[PDB]
C-alpha cells in the first residue's frame, strides 16, 4: 500500500510523489 503522509514518509518507505488533499500538500510514500 501507499500513503499520502504529512510531514514525511516513514522509515522503510520511499517518496514516489506528492498528494494534494484540501489545500495541503503530502508526501506520496510507498
CA distances 5 to 10, 14, 26, Å, are: 8, 11, 5
Tell me the domain boundaries of the chain.
1-30
Elucidation method: X-ray
- Exposure string for 1-12, b = 16+ CB within 10 A, e = fewer: eeeeeeeebeee
Distance CA 2, CA 19 (A): 11
Cell 494534494 identifies what position?
20
Question: Cα(first)–Cα(last) distance of the chain, in Å?
Answer: 6
Q: How many Cβ atoms from other residues are within 10 Å of residue 13's Cβ?
A: 15
Do 30 and 7 touch, CB atoms closer than 8 A?
no
Amino acid at each position: 500500500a501507499c500513503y499520502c503522509r504529512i510531514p514525511a514518509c516513514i522509515a522503510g518507505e520511499r517518496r514516489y510523489g506528492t498528494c494534494i488533499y484540501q489545500g495541503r500538500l503530502a508526501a506520496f510514500c510507498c
